[PDB]
DNA sequence: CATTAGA
DNA sequence: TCTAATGG
C-alpha cells in the first residue's frame, strides 16, 4: 500500500504504456500481474532477487527494479515521458471515442494536436466529433449542487411520461459524492422484466422526452437498452451556461434492478465486501441476481428481490445506507 | 463483460 | 462479421 509504491508505481507506468504506445498486450500483462503481486507483499522489497522470487516476477522486471531501487529513476521510463510520439498517443486518447487504436493512427497520419483533430474532424466519427467538440466541458467534475437539479428533471419527465417508470440515478451521487464525473441512471418499468420481450420504447420514450425539453443535446450512442449521451442545464437568466454533461440511462427488466440498482452504486469494494460475503451466508451475488448456493460446488434458482433490503436481508446482513457504502 | 458504432 | 470504445 505504501511500502511497496515506486515499485507498483513504475510498473504499472510500465505496462500501461506496453498496452497503449504499443501493441505488447503481453508484457502489458505481464508488469500488471508483477505490479499485482509485489503490490501484495508484505515487505520492503530490497532488491530484484528479493523480487524475483515471486511468481510473475522475472529477470526482466526484477532487472527494472534495481534500477530504479539504485537511483530513484527509469530510463525506459524516463525516455516514454520524453517521446513526443508516446507522449501524443497518451493525450489524443483522452477524447471521448479516442482509443488507443485509433490514437496510434491519428498520429500516424500527424495528429497529434487537439486542434490537429480540429483541421480534420472529418476523419473523426461522430462519438469522437462530440468527444472532441465537448473536450473541456467532459473534463470537468459534476458538483452536487447541479447533480441534484439535473436528477430532479430527469425525475419529471420520467414520471410525466410514464408513471409507471421507476428511476435512480446510481453511483457517487447516490453514496453522498460532493462531486460526479457522469450521471448514470438505472431505468426500469413493470411492463419489462427477465422474459417479457421487450419494449425498446420504452427507453425510447424518455430519452425523446429528454431531448423535447432540451436536457440531452445529443447522441452518443443509443440502443434498445443502453443510451448514451449529453446534457445541459437550462442556462439561466443568463451570464452563466452550464457544462455539457455526459450522461447514461439503461433500460431494465424490472426483476432485477435493486442488484443492478445494488451494484452500480458501488463502492466497488462495498460490493465486493458485499459480494464476498453472500458467499459464506451460502449465497452469490452479480449485476442482475443472488442465487442460493448448492453444496456441489455450484447452483442457481434467482432469489426474488423488491428492494435493496431484500438483498442485505439474504445475505442477512445490516441495510447500509448509500451514504456508507464507502467500503 | 456486455452493449453499440462502424466498415 | 469483427473489431473498437465505453462503462462499470
Ligand atoms: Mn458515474
Ligand atoms: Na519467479
Ligand atoms: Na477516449
Known amino acids: 500500500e505504501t511500502l511497496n509504491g515506486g515499485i507498483t508505481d513504475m510498473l504499472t507506468e510500465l505496462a500501461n504504456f506496453e498496452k497503449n504506445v504499443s501493441q505488447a498486450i503481453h508484457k502489458y500483462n505481464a508488469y500488471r500481474k508483477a505490479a ?51 507522449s501524443s ?8 471515442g479516442i ?5 496510434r493512427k491519428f498520429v500516424d497520419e500527424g495528429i497529434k494536436t487537439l486542434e490537429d483533430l ?16 465537448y473536450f473541456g466541458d467532459f473534463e470537468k467534475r459534476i458538483p452536487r449542487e447541479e447533480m441534484l437539479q439535473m436528477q430532479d428533471i430527469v425525475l419529471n419527465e420520467v414520471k410525466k411520461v410514464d408513471s409507471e417508470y421507476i428511476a435512480t440515478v446510481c453511483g457517487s451521487f447516490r453514496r453522498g459524492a460532493e462531486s460526479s464525473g457522469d450521471m448514470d441512471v438505472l431505468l426500469t418499468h413493470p411492463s419489462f422484466t427477465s422474459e417479457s420481450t421487450k419494449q425498446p420504447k420504452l ?5 425523446e422526452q429528454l431531448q423535447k425539453v432540451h436536457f440531452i443535446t445529443d447522441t452518443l450512442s443509443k440502443g434498445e437498452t443502453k443510451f448514451m449521451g449529453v446534457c445541459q442545464l437550462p442556462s439561466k437568466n443568463d451570464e452563466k451556461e452550464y457544462p455539457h454533461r455526459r450522461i447514461d440511462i439503461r433500460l431494465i427488466p424490472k426483476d432485477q434492478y435493486y442488484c443492478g440498482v445494488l451494484y452500480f452504486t458501488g463502492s466497488d469494494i462495498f460490493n465486493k465486501n458485499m459480494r ?19 453444496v456441489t460446488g455450484v447452483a442457481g434458482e434467482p432469489l426474488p428481490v423488491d428492494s435493496e433490503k431484500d438483498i442485505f436481508d439474504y445475505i442477512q446482513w445490516k441495510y447500509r445506507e448509500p451514504k456508507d457504502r464507502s467500503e
Request: hydrophobic share 35%; charged share 30%; net charge positive.
Open 203 to 207: 427507453l425510447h420514450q424518455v430519452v
Open 36 to 86: 499485482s503481486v509485489i503490490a501484495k507483499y508484505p515487505h520492503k522489497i530490497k532488491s530484484g532477487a528479493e523480487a524475483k522470487k515471486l511468481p510473475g516476477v522475472g529477470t526482466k522486471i526484477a532487472e527494472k527494479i534495481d534500477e530504479f531501487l539504485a537511483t530513484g529513476k527509469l530510463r525506459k521510463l524516463e525516455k516514454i515521458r520524453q517521446d513526443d510520439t508516446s
Open 118 to 133: 480540429r483541421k480534420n474532424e472529418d476523419k473523426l466519427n461522430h462519438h469522437q466529433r462530440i468527444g472532441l467538440k
Open 89 to 96: 498517443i497518451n493525450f489524443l486518447t483522452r477524447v471521448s
Open 99 to 103: 482509443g488507443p487504436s485509433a490514437a
Open 276 to 294: 464476498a460475503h453472500a458467499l459464506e451466508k451460502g449465497f452469490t451475488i452479480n449485476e442482475y441476481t443472488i442465487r442460493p448456493l448448492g
